[PDB]
């Protein structure tokens, strides 16, 4: 119910035109997206977490310095695909919500790609298995992720 | 060459009593230890890194917010073995030097244990292989590290 | 869809009494469980994989020597809780199917615990988050898994 | 002491021309290299391990089926760079010795590349940091390793 309802909310975000009101490339913009997707579903919708979380051997940015990290991440440049991917990779490492980081930050990435490069990711053609592998590796080396995503951009 | 002299430098730190002048439980204190062990050996002795580093697939705190991270980590409480281990785990994730984090931060840990618990680690009885495993796991769960060290304390 | 239907099959395995005919602690027994759960749902139901697979940075036993590995794994002893967990850990590393290893092998584990200790895991009280973490760690050290499961055995 | 003495033996393996007498692409050939490097230094020189080992959170092939694994791995083809790297990656996962797998298996790799492609790796121009990263990743995805090594091939 939660994930189907948030998918409907994501659809609403685009169909409504409310997507055009989201700040691009900023922490606030990511919060806007998360609040939109999960509002009325998670009580923490749009809110930066205060608890620590991990997945698959990686511990995401410690909540005690997550806000400081986000301030630095949102200032990263967006001039090229490689810069945009690097910025996305650091926002994923920040992982600022208890849940729904993936969906919200992928929308956030698409807005950055669209603003700067006039392209978005064609997610329907991206393997979820290969995407997860590439994201898991990305804090160490974003090569796999860049190869995967660059092949799946659409203008 | 470097490791041999730095081991001599660590013995001098203790045997001279210079160890008693090290600030306990702080970033500055860790820098003091690192400067003492590696002064004249690494030109970055005592200095917070500006480059990014990883080991075993784990990305240590990004250099862009590392200084900010350290300000927070050093304020962590030190009242119990579990608190002190948690603080140590976070200082390891920070990994604030290019090299020599292990040796420096273990001395740092012992000073915190000594101050607050009147105990230090009996490293003589700790397997390096098992210690490395526990440290690698610690960001996700410090159970292995607590299991390894707690009954290896000595007063 | 597949998950809801396989769950129904797993309930039927127990409710029908068919569970009592499953060979305990063997590769063939694991295959019997997988075929029952996934027959008609995955065309590879019950079948040892010929493709390589990975999760979270760990590559499961190479398909080229998987059958050989399974021959050794099923011979492992089941004399104590700790031996049984060790055997379960090796069967998870083998990871013999393309999908459904988790559900099938947890049933397989319970049959081994029941046969040798007259216990099963009370999975209802086991955190999925902590279980996944413990499984991810288990190839290196099964301490987390033993801590988790021993606290959740039932008669 | 052992690392320096083994380097000298490695030096001699090439200086003497004995490298030309080593069996190429086989388990026996790898054991020959390991014995040349470490015979008289490690008591287990040239011997397939009977103990389990791991590094960086990765469990190498279980000793109970390591021999069976090696029988399969040595049969892997060697016709393309990609096949040769895949074979090397599997021999590293097998990790057949207690110690000295890296040095011995890199020599083994060069012999297979030399035989089949008339090239070897120019290890002088390969970053040890990037190499270890690429090795750690290789069981999941050998792209990093292939990217790192292919443009460092020489004759
Ligand atoms: N080990 C890891 N290291 C770094 N990033 C990871 C790791 N595991 C998962 N990720 C990323 O974290 C995301 C999942 O975060 P989560 O907060 O569960 O988002 P979600 O929207 O609920 N699920 P999803 O749609 O699967 O992304 C994945 O899509 C990956 O981008
Ligand atoms: N994958 C990992 N994840 C988290 N921590 C790690 C990892 N690998 C190593 N460590 C920790 O990092 C330390 C090594 O950092 P490093 O900067 O190499 O210190 P060192 O003093 O040069 N070597 P050592 O004496 O082996 O600790 C180890 O002792 C562990 O505490
Ligand atoms: N990185 C890892 N290393 C070792 N084991 C893992 C890892 N990730 C997951 N596992 C185990 O693999 C199982 C999942 O295997 P899979 O074939 O997807 O089974 P499933 O029944 O489809 N899913 P689940 O019900 O979630 O177990 C998990 O339940 C864990 O036991
Ligand atoms: N986490 C890992 N996963 C896969 N392979 C690894 C991992 N860590 C290290 N390796 C590989 O194992 C080798 C080290 O094996 P080891 O038996 O220590 O050999 P060594 O010759 O003693 N050391 P080195 O000269 O550094 O390779 C490295 O060179 C890597 O190829
Ligand atoms: Mg999620
Ligand atoms: Mg070091
Ligand atoms: Mg699954
Ligand atoms: Mg070694």
XYZ file of C-alpha atoms and ligand atoms in Angstrom:
748
model
C 0.000 0.000 0.000
C 2.790 2.456 0.948
C 4.926 1.815 -2.147
C 1.949 1.802 -4.517
C 0.622 5.042 -2.945
C 4.035 6.747 -3.207
C 4.279 5.617 -6.850
C 0.923 7.293 -7.459
C 2.272 10.405 -5.678
C 5.344 10.369 -7.932
C 3.016 10.135 -10.941
C 0.942 13.052 -9.552
C 4.131 15.109 -9.103
C 4.826 14.998 -12.856
C 1.261 14.995 -14.275
C 0.170 17.910 -12.059
C 3.086 20.096 -13.152
C 4.229 20.314 -9.503
C 7.577 18.828 -10.647
C 8.281 22.197 -12.308
C 8.186 23.872 -8.855
C 10.864 21.651 -7.250
C 14.252 23.321 -6.557
C 16.962 21.637 -8.627
C 20.198 20.282 -7.140
C 19.683 21.361 -3.511
C 18.955 19.621 -0.222
C 15.646 21.543 0.015
C 14.728 20.243 -3.422
C 15.326 16.678 -2.348
C 13.201 17.307 0.774
C 10.423 18.710 -1.459
C 10.401 15.500 -3.557
C 10.480 13.207 -0.490
C 7.661 15.166 1.229
C 5.627 14.899 -2.003
C 6.196 11.161 -2.474
C 5.738 10.082 1.157
C 3.547 12.760 2.749
C 0.752 11.117 4.710
C 2.589 7.766 4.406
C 5.684 8.295 6.562
C 5.598 10.756 9.470
C 9.243 11.622 8.585
C 8.282 12.649 5.003
C 10.640 15.405 3.879
C 12.606 15.314 7.149
C 16.319 14.671 7.502
C 16.910 11.613 9.696
C 18.345 11.659 13.201
C 19.158 7.929 13.314
C 21.992 5.975 11.667
C 21.333 3.462 8.856
C 23.333 1.027 6.754
C 22.840 -1.263 3.779
C 25.031 -4.093 2.425
C 28.143 -3.259 4.474
C 28.024 0.503 3.979
C 27.051 2.835 6.806
C 25.558 6.022 5.333
C 26.673 9.479 6.555
C 26.410 9.683 10.331
C 23.281 11.553 11.375
C 25.379 13.675 13.725
C 27.088 15.352 10.742
C 24.575 14.651 7.981
C 23.376 18.285 7.829
C 26.943 19.543 7.537
C 27.536 16.970 4.749
C 24.402 18.035 2.870
C 25.536 21.713 2.909
C 28.721 20.642 1.155
C 27.043 18.201 -1.251
C 24.475 20.690 -2.571
C 27.343 23.086 -3.478
C 28.921 20.495 -5.837
C 29.036 21.543 -9.484
C 26.689 20.239 -12.213
C 28.525 21.160 -15.432
C 29.021 17.738 -16.977
C 27.539 14.252 -16.759
C 30.544 13.179 -14.710
C 30.088 16.017 -12.206
C 26.356 15.323 -11.946
C 26.949 11.647 -11.309
C 29.594 12.513 -8.680
C 27.115 14.810 -6.936
C 24.392 12.125 -7.039
C 26.878 9.611 -5.624
C 27.564 11.889 -2.625
C 23.844 12.543 -2.121
C 23.289 8.769 -2.092
C 26.076 8.431 0.511
C 24.289 11.119 2.572
C 21.053 9.040 2.297
C 19.250 11.678 4.276
C 15.906 9.966 5.009
C 15.004 6.857 7.002
C 13.388 5.383 3.893
C 12.682 6.294 0.262
C 16.121 7.697 -0.520
C 16.382 5.775 -3.785
C 13.134 6.917 -5.382
C 13.412 10.503 -4.193
C 17.060 10.962 -5.131
C 16.613 9.403 -8.577
C 13.976 12.086 -9.291
C 16.437 14.648 -7.913
C 19.149 13.337 -10.284
C 16.812 13.523 -13.287
C 16.037 17.220 -12.517
C 19.770 17.994 -12.378
C 20.397 16.139 -15.625
C 17.472 17.904 -17.251
C 18.496 21.405 -16.141
C 22.138 21.084 -17.131
C 22.245 18.573 -20.001
C 18.621 18.565 -21.248
C 18.478 14.801 -20.683
C 17.064 12.385 -18.137
C 17.671 8.704 -17.369
C 15.499 6.245 -19.262
C 14.956 4.135 -16.148
C 12.765 1.536 -17.901
C 15.898 0.314 -19.742
C 18.156 0.159 -16.666
C 18.504 -3.223 -14.963
C 17.629 -2.959 -11.272
C 20.213 -5.667 -10.497
C 22.981 -3.829 -12.354
C 21.841 -0.466 -10.908
C 22.058 -1.758 -7.341
C 25.538 -3.204 -7.991
C 26.672 0.101 -9.474
C 25.263 2.128 -6.570
C 26.868 -0.204 -4.019
C 30.232 0.336 -5.682
C 29.807 4.063 -6.309
C 31.278 5.430 -3.054
C 34.608 3.794 -4.006
C 34.425 4.126 -7.785
C 31.555 5.458 -9.879
C 32.845 3.857 -13.142
C 30.173 1.128 -13.168
C 27.424 3.684 -12.502
C 28.647 6.097 -15.194
C 28.813 3.284 -17.745
C 25.324 2.095 -16.857
C 23.603 5.488 -16.813
C 25.397 7.191 -19.721
C 24.065 4.455 -22.038
C 20.542 5.070 -20.812
C 20.114 8.817 -21.132
C 17.256 10.187 -23.223
C 16.853 13.683 -24.677
C 61.802 2.136 7.614
C 58.897 4.471 8.412
C 57.003 1.822 10.424
C 60.122 0.920 12.421
C 60.893 4.526 13.399
C 57.196 5.205 14.142
C 57.088 2.185 16.474
C 60.185 3.616 18.233
C 58.397 6.999 18.364
C 55.320 5.381 19.984
C 57.491 3.683 22.622
C 59.143 7.069 23.325
C 55.701 8.703 23.645
C 54.884 6.301 26.470
C 58.301 5.741 28.089
C 59.145 9.474 28.190
C 55.840 10.297 29.846
C 55.001 12.604 26.894
C 51.781 10.491 26.652
C 50.515 12.292 29.785
C 50.466 15.615 27.865
C 48.137 14.329 25.100
C 44.601 15.763 25.161
C 42.209 12.842 25.714
C 39.266 12.052 23.470
C 39.623 14.983 21.061
C 40.562 15.557 17.442
C 43.506 17.722 18.566
C 44.656 14.861 20.794
C 44.573 12.423 17.890
C 46.579 14.920 15.803
C 49.138 15.227 18.657
C 49.578 11.453 18.660
C 49.859 11.282 14.875
C 52.403 14.142 14.827
C 54.446 12.399 17.528
C 54.503 9.016 15.762
C 55.089 10.243 12.181
C 56.837 13.627 12.562
C 59.838 13.554 10.243
C 58.470 10.469 8.449
C 55.319 11.749 6.703
C 55.099 15.393 5.672
C 51.395 15.210 6.568
C 52.122 14.133 10.192
C 49.398 15.486 12.450
C 47.449 17.005 9.498
C 43.837 16.335 8.526
C 43.662 14.902 4.996
C 42.174 16.778 2.023
C 42.034 13.734 -0.266
C 39.526 10.885 -0.260
C 40.419 7.360 0.814
C 38.758 3.924 0.988
C 39.668 0.395 2.078
C 37.990 -2.949 1.429
C 35.161 -1.363 -0.475
C 34.380 1.160 2.318
C 34.600 4.924 1.643
C 35.855 6.823 4.689
C 34.320 10.214 5.465
C 34.527 12.541 2.457
C 37.299 15.118 2.791
C 34.792 17.878 1.956
C 33.022 17.401 5.323
C 35.682 15.577 7.345
C 36.597 18.596 9.503
C 32.925 19.104 10.236
C 32.563 15.400 11.063
C 35.478 15.546 13.526
C 33.926 18.489 15.454
C 30.913 16.271 16.079
C 32.761 12.979 16.774
C 34.973 14.481 19.454
C 31.871 15.577 21.437
C 30.622 11.994 21.765
C 30.356 10.791 25.385
C 32.849 8.395 27.004
C 30.979 7.074 30.045
C 30.878 3.326 29.331
C 32.836 0.759 27.335
C 30.043 0.794 24.758
C 30.078 4.583 24.408
C 33.867 4.622 24.089
C 33.800 1.877 21.433
C 31.093 3.829 19.532
C 33.240 6.962 19.606
C 36.276 4.984 18.446
C 34.252 3.423 15.611
C 33.227 6.889 14.433
C 36.811 8.150 14.628
C 37.813 5.196 12.484
C 35.106 5.997 9.910
C 36.410 9.602 9.875
C 39.889 8.141 9.191
C 41.336 11.653 9.271
C 44.926 10.998 8.045
C 46.217 9.667 4.730
C 48.100 6.947 6.579
C 48.712 5.869 10.187
C 45.119 6.062 11.334
C 45.203 2.611 12.941
C 48.208 3.040 15.207
C 47.349 6.616 16.198
C 43.692 5.982 16.923
C 44.403 2.830 18.991
C 46.605 4.931 21.290
C 43.766 7.507 21.305
C 41.294 4.775 22.315
C 43.520 3.536 25.157
C 43.731 7.065 26.582
C 39.933 7.345 26.575
C 39.536 3.919 28.204
C 42.182 4.820 30.795
C 40.576 8.158 31.681
C 37.020 6.929 31.985
C 37.294 3.209 32.907
C 40.830 2.991 34.392
C 41.542 0.236 31.898
C 43.387 -0.185 28.598
C 43.335 -2.858 25.935
C 45.686 -5.810 26.453
C 46.661 -5.749 22.751
C 49.127 -8.581 23.386
C 46.128 -10.927 23.634
C 44.257 -9.576 20.578
C 44.591 -11.274 17.179
C 45.484 -8.733 14.498
C 43.480 -10.794 11.989
C 40.363 -10.754 14.156
C 40.908 -7.093 15.059
C 41.002 -6.076 11.377
C 37.841 -8.080 10.675
C 36.042 -6.453 13.605
C 37.107 -2.971 12.510
C 35.939 -3.650 8.940
C 32.541 -4.670 10.308
C 32.278 -1.978 12.982
C 30.589 0.703 10.913
C 27.615 -1.612 10.404
C 27.734 -3.379 13.772
C 30.336 -3.057 16.527
C 29.366 -6.405 18.102
C 32.485 -8.233 16.793
C 34.716 -5.424 18.110
C 33.065 -5.347 21.548
C 33.228 -9.161 21.690
C 36.958 -9.035 20.861
C 38.011 -6.226 23.195
C 35.740 -6.206 26.230
C 37.322 -9.157 28.057
C 40.792 -8.114 26.809
C 40.816 -4.974 28.973
C 43.432 -4.784 31.751
C 43.799 -2.501 34.791
C 2.571 -11.986 -7.277
C 5.178 -14.773 -7.371
C 5.897 -14.023 -3.715
C 2.230 -14.210 -2.632
C 1.797 -17.510 -4.483
C 5.016 -19.070 -3.161
C 3.918 -18.111 0.372
C 0.708 -20.031 -0.201
C 2.758 -23.010 -1.385
C 4.972 -22.793 1.712
C 1.892 -22.816 3.995
C 0.544 -25.809 2.067
C 3.912 -27.605 2.495
C 3.317 -27.532 6.267
C -0.488 -27.764 6.383
C -0.585 -30.788 4.040
C 2.064 -32.701 5.986
C 4.259 -32.791 2.854
C 6.985 -31.159 4.998
C 7.439 -34.544 6.720
C 8.624 -36.110 3.466
C 11.401 -33.592 2.802
C 14.908 -35.036 3.153
C 16.628 -33.264 6.007
C 20.003 -31.545 5.680
C 20.746 -32.508 2.071
C 20.971 -30.763 -1.312
C 18.103 -32.881 -2.602
C 16.010 -31.822 0.412
C 16.701 -28.168 -0.360
C 15.731 -28.786 -3.986
C 12.509 -30.495 -2.854
C 11.627 -27.408 -0.811
C 12.428 -25.016 -3.689
C 10.388 -27.080 -6.213
C 7.415 -27.061 -3.808
C 7.575 -23.338 -3.140
C 8.255 -22.203 -6.709
C 6.934 -24.940 -9.021
C 5.032 -23.262 -11.867
C 6.271 -19.847 -10.691
C 9.963 -20.052 -11.696
C 10.840 -22.323 -14.580
C 14.087 -23.140 -12.683
C 12.160 -24.282 -9.553
C 14.223 -27.001 -7.823
C 17.108 -26.664 -10.281
C 20.748 -25.939 -9.490
C 21.816 -22.756 -11.301
C 24.347 -22.577 -14.103
C 24.803 -18.778 -13.952
C 26.841 -16.727 -11.541
C 25.085 -14.415 -9.092
C 26.073 -11.894 -6.426
C 24.534 -9.714 -3.722
C 25.891 -6.718 -1.839
C 29.500 -7.250 -2.981
C 29.650 -11.006 -2.337
C 29.787 -13.461 -5.261
C 28.160 -16.765 -4.373
C 29.808 -20.110 -5.180
C 30.820 -20.192 -8.851
C 28.331 -22.235 -10.898
C 31.264 -24.151 -12.438
C 32.023 -25.839 -9.064
C 28.655 -25.378 -7.337
C 27.587 -29.028 -7.628
C 30.933 -30.132 -6.177
C 30.566 -27.634 -3.348
C 27.081 -28.878 -2.568
C 28.371 -32.476 -2.272
C 30.718 -31.319 0.536
C 28.253 -28.940 2.189
C 25.526 -31.526 2.655
C 28.048 -33.800 4.438
C 28.644 -31.195 7.173
C 27.698 -32.339 10.663
C 24.599 -31.199 12.532
C 25.566 -32.075 16.089
C 25.119 -28.706 17.843
C 23.419 -25.377 17.221
C 26.782 -23.953 16.149
C 27.487 -26.754 13.632
C 24.020 -26.374 12.221
C 24.432 -22.624 11.771
C 27.857 -23.238 10.160
C 26.228 -25.676 7.712
C 23.428 -23.170 6.975
C 26.041 -20.450 6.347
C 27.816 -22.683 3.797
C 24.548 -23.571 2.073
C 23.758 -19.832 1.840
C 27.213 -19.201 0.280
C 26.431 -21.967 -2.207
C 23.165 -20.122 -2.986
C 22.160 -22.858 -5.428
C 19.157 -21.231 -7.153
C 18.777 -18.102 -9.271
C 16.120 -16.815 -6.829
C 14.297 -18.020 -3.700
C 17.404 -19.198 -1.834
C 16.441 -17.321 1.323
C 12.939 -18.705 1.823
C 13.836 -22.255 0.747
C 17.007 -22.476 2.852
C 15.380 -21.048 5.999
C 12.839 -23.905 5.805
C 15.772 -26.284 5.273
C 17.524 -24.854 8.366
C 14.424 -25.336 10.533
C 14.210 -29.004 9.524
C 17.828 -29.524 10.583
C 17.302 -27.697 13.908
C 14.139 -29.698 14.565
C 15.733 -33.074 13.769
C 18.847 -32.517 15.866
C 17.825 -30.110 18.636
C 13.989 -30.265 18.684
C 13.973 -26.500 18.081
C 13.058 -24.192 15.244
C 13.655 -20.493 14.646
C 10.789 -18.246 15.685
C 11.112 -16.141 12.541
C 8.165 -13.952 13.590
C 10.453 -12.381 16.233
C 13.538 -11.989 14.020
C 14.149 -8.529 12.557
C 14.494 -8.785 8.756
C 16.958 -5.878 8.859
C 19.197 -7.527 11.459
C 18.807 -10.935 9.759
C 19.985 -9.592 6.407
C 22.926 -7.851 8.101
C 23.865 -11.053 9.909
C 23.625 -13.129 6.718
C 25.746 -10.615 4.794
C 28.419 -10.938 7.470
C 28.117 -14.690 7.952
C 30.653 -15.875 5.361
C 33.384 -14.030 7.337
C 32.000 -14.470 10.857
C 28.725 -16.066 11.940
C 28.746 -14.397 15.394
C 26.051 -11.880 14.504
C 23.840 -14.648 13.095
C 24.356 -16.936 16.092
C 23.585 -14.038 18.503
C 20.424 -13.260 16.525
C 19.102 -16.790 16.064
C 20.012 -18.408 19.388
C 17.928 -15.708 21.157
C 14.956 -16.700 18.938
C 14.734 -20.491 19.096
C 11.430 -22.099 20.086
C 10.087 -25.537 21.047
C 62.256 -10.903 6.606
C 60.098 -13.197 4.461
C 58.899 -10.427 2.100
C 62.468 -9.349 1.246
C 63.787 -12.902 0.786
C 60.825 -13.828 -1.457
C 61.375 -10.703 -3.583
C 64.962 -11.905 -4.141
C 63.637 -15.334 -5.150
C 61.190 -13.666 -7.519
C 64.105 -11.658 -8.955
C 66.001 -14.887 -9.458
C 63.032 -16.702 -11.089
C 63.305 -14.211 -13.981
C 67.094 -13.546 -13.951
C 67.882 -17.264 -14.209
C 65.384 -18.006 -16.936
C 63.623 -20.500 -14.655
C 60.342 -18.609 -15.315
C 60.436 -20.313 -18.716
C 60.166 -23.796 -17.101
C 56.956 -23.071 -15.150
C 53.749 -24.788 -16.351
C 51.363 -22.144 -17.758
C 47.745 -21.662 -16.690
C 47.486 -24.624 -14.318
C 47.114 -25.129 -10.610
C 50.423 -27.040 -10.641
C 52.076 -24.094 -12.362
C 50.816 -21.746 -9.671
C 52.141 -24.070 -6.969
C 55.524 -24.112 -8.771
C 55.671 -20.321 -8.609
C 54.657 -20.329 -4.942
C 57.318 -22.911 -4.080
C 59.984 -20.950 -5.996
C 59.135 -17.723 -4.163
C 58.527 -19.100 -0.706
C 60.173 -22.555 -0.422
C 62.177 -22.503 2.813
C 60.437 -19.280 3.964
C 56.814 -20.437 4.422
C 56.461 -23.970 5.708
C 53.358 -24.264 3.497
C 55.135 -23.108 0.307
C 53.499 -24.605 -2.790
C 50.769 -26.318 -0.728
C 47.019 -25.902 -1.145
C 45.626 -24.596 2.137
C 43.389 -26.605 4.454
C 42.353 -23.552 6.507
C 39.726 -20.956 5.689
C 40.711 -17.348 5.010
C 39.015 -14.026 4.206
C 40.006 -10.457 3.515
C 38.127 -7.186 3.470
C 34.838 -8.922 4.244
C 35.184 -11.440 1.373
C 35.362 -15.185 2.172
C 37.718 -17.046 -0.191
C 36.735 -20.486 -1.486
C 36.018 -22.831 1.393
C 38.841 -25.266 2.058
C 36.367 -28.199 1.916
C 35.883 -27.666 -1.829
C 38.956 -25.606 -2.822
C 40.621 -28.586 -4.613
C 37.456 -29.300 -6.607
C 37.265 -25.608 -7.472
C 40.878 -25.542 -8.701
C 40.225 -28.542 -11.002
C 37.524 -26.456 -12.725
C 39.320 -23.099 -12.719
C 42.452 -24.424 -14.451
C 40.253 -25.678 -17.305
C 39.016 -22.158 -18.079
C 39.939 -20.847 -21.536
C 42.702 -18.370 -22.259
C 42.006 -17.119 -25.786
C 41.026 -13.492 -25.115
C 42.136 -10.875 -22.610
C 38.650 -11.008 -21.107
C 38.834 -14.838 -20.671
C 42.321 -14.602 -19.161
C 41.184 -11.965 -16.654
C 38.080 -14.052 -15.836
C 40.362 -17.035 -15.144
C 42.685 -14.899 -12.984
C 39.674 -13.528 -11.091
C 38.543 -17.117 -10.313
C 42.047 -18.142 -9.229
C 42.109 -15.157 -6.875
C 38.696 -16.165 -5.426
C 40.122 -19.655 -4.886
C 43.102 -18.016 -3.132
C 44.752 -21.419 -2.748
C 47.558 -20.543 -0.277
C 47.602 -19.239 3.285
C 49.800 -16.307 2.171
C 51.534 -15.066 -0.981
C 48.549 -15.500 -3.304
C 48.947 -11.999 -4.748
C 52.562 -12.194 -5.826
C 52.369 -15.809 -7.050
C 49.154 -15.385 -9.006
C 50.238 -12.130 -10.680
C 53.253 -14.014 -12.085
C 50.862 -16.801 -13.143
C 48.647 -14.216 -14.899
C 51.608 -12.789 -16.797
C 52.579 -16.251 -18.038
C 49.042 -16.837 -19.372
C 48.947 -13.370 -21.056
C 52.432 -13.942 -22.543
C 51.526 -17.380 -23.899
C 48.190 -16.388 -25.407
C 48.483 -12.688 -26.281
C 52.268 -12.141 -26.367
C 51.870 -9.419 -23.754
C 52.375 -8.975 -20.013
C 51.147 -6.382 -17.491
C 53.439 -3.389 -17.028
C 53.079 -3.521 -13.259
C 55.330 -0.483 -12.777
C 52.535 1.739 -14.205
C 49.684 0.091 -12.264
C 48.688 1.885 -9.022
C 48.729 -0.576 -6.103
C 45.785 1.316 -4.554
C 43.687 1.044 -7.747
C 44.806 -2.575 -8.291
C 43.615 -3.651 -4.847
C 40.320 -1.804 -5.332
C 39.849 -3.546 -8.670
C 40.714 -6.953 -7.174
C 38.206 -6.449 -4.322
C 35.519 -5.642 -6.861
C 36.431 -8.334 -9.383
C 34.205 -11.157 -8.049
C 31.114 -8.975 -8.598
C 32.287 -7.141 -11.720
C 35.741 -7.343 -13.305
C 35.274 -4.121 -15.352
C 37.507 -2.082 -13.029
C 40.282 -4.687 -13.287
C 40.013 -5.073 -17.081
C 40.006 -1.270 -17.502
C 43.012 -0.911 -15.226
C 45.096 -3.686 -16.769
C 44.327 -3.692 -20.519
C 45.947 -0.301 -21.266
C 48.940 -1.325 -19.123
C 49.757 -4.353 -21.276
C 53.223 -4.319 -22.861
C 55.720 -6.572 -24.627
N 25.604 -0.740 0.026
C 25.163 0.400 -0.550
N 25.980 1.456 -0.712
C 25.567 2.598 -1.275
N 24.310 2.768 -1.727
C 23.391 1.774 -1.623
C 23.773 0.506 -1.025
N 22.680 -0.288 -1.046
C 21.689 0.397 -1.630
N 22.118 1.627 -1.997
C 21.316 2.692 -2.604
O 20.208 2.945 -1.717
C 18.992 2.905 -2.459
C 17.880 2.384 -1.561
O 17.645 3.334 -0.522
P 16.217 3.333 0.221
O 16.229 4.429 1.245
O 15.795 1.914 0.543
O 15.349 3.830 -1.050
P 13.935 3.265 -1.564
O 13.410 4.364 -2.493
O 13.149 2.929 -0.322
N 14.190 1.803 -2.445
P 14.712 1.697 -4.104
O 13.543 2.078 -4.978
O 15.086 0.232 -4.191
O 15.901 2.606 -4.328
C 19.275 2.021 -3.662
O 18.422 2.340 -4.765
C 20.715 2.368 -3.953
O 20.725 3.582 -4.711
N 37.472 -1.796 5.208
C 37.635 -1.117 6.374
N 36.618 -0.472 6.954
C 36.761 0.206 8.120
N 37.939 0.285 8.776
C 39.039 -0.312 8.297
C 38.954 -1.055 7.034
N 40.181 -1.543 6.801
C 40.987 -1.149 7.811
N 40.294 -0.415 8.714
C 40.827 0.253 9.924
O 41.866 1.153 9.460
C 43.074 0.899 10.143
C 44.213 1.120 9.151
O 44.271 2.476 8.740
P 45.729 2.986 8.276
O 45.597 4.448 8.001
O 46.291 2.023 7.264
O 46.521 2.785 9.696
P 47.991 2.190 9.980
O 48.365 2.541 11.412
O 48.821 2.714 8.834
N 47.948 0.453 9.811
P 47.476 -0.653 11.073
O 48.604 -0.657 12.085
O 47.344 -1.947 10.294
O 46.170 -0.209 11.676
C 42.948 -0.541 10.613
O 43.793 -0.865 11.721
C 41.472 -0.656 10.951
O 41.246 -0.101 12.237
N 25.710 -10.103 0.621
C 25.210 -11.288 1.037
N 26.021 -12.282 1.435
C 25.556 -13.455 1.872
N 24.243 -13.736 1.925
C 23.336 -12.822 1.522
C 23.763 -11.514 1.049
N 22.655 -10.826 0.740
C 21.596 -11.617 0.978
N 22.019 -12.802 1.456
C 21.205 -13.948 1.785
O 20.520 -14.248 0.563
C 19.134 -14.392 0.870
C 18.313 -13.944 -0.315
O 18.535 -14.804 -1.435
P 17.426 -14.838 -2.601
O 17.756 -15.884 -3.602
O 17.004 -13.453 -3.016
O 16.204 -15.475 -1.707
P 14.671 -14.973 -1.586
O 13.927 -16.053 -0.825
O 14.253 -14.707 -3.016
N 14.608 -13.509 -0.665
P 14.441 -13.420 1.060
O 13.049 -13.945 1.418
O 14.585 -11.927 1.254
O 15.536 -14.216 1.722
C 18.914 -13.528 2.103
O 17.757 -13.948 2.818
C 20.188 -13.738 2.869
O 20.069 -14.980 3.579
N 38.524 -8.403 -0.481
C 39.168 -9.045 -1.500
N 38.526 -9.705 -2.472
C 39.168 -10.331 -3.481
N 40.514 -10.305 -3.592
C 41.268 -9.660 -2.677
C 40.623 -8.985 -1.551
N 41.594 -8.437 -0.820
C 42.772 -8.726 -1.409
N 42.566 -9.454 -2.518
C 43.578 -10.024 -3.419
O 44.475 -10.861 -2.651
C 45.832 -10.461 -2.880
C 46.568 -10.608 -1.557
O 46.630 -11.988 -1.213
P 47.810 -12.462 -0.239
O 47.750 -13.955 -0.012
O 47.971 -11.488 0.878
O 49.042 -12.190 -1.274
P 50.430 -11.434 -0.986
O 51.297 -11.740 -2.183
O 50.887 -11.937 0.371
N 50.137 -9.732 -0.884
P 50.095 -8.655 -2.262
O 51.507 -8.595 -2.782
O 49.645 -7.343 -1.673
O 49.128 -9.207 -3.279
C 45.751 -9.021 -3.363
O 46.883 -8.697 -4.183
C 44.449 -9.029 -4.138
O 44.686 -9.590 -5.430
Mg 13.672 1.163 1.012
Mg 48.706 1.840 6.714
Mg 14.934 -12.636 -4.121
Mg 49.865 -11.026 2.306
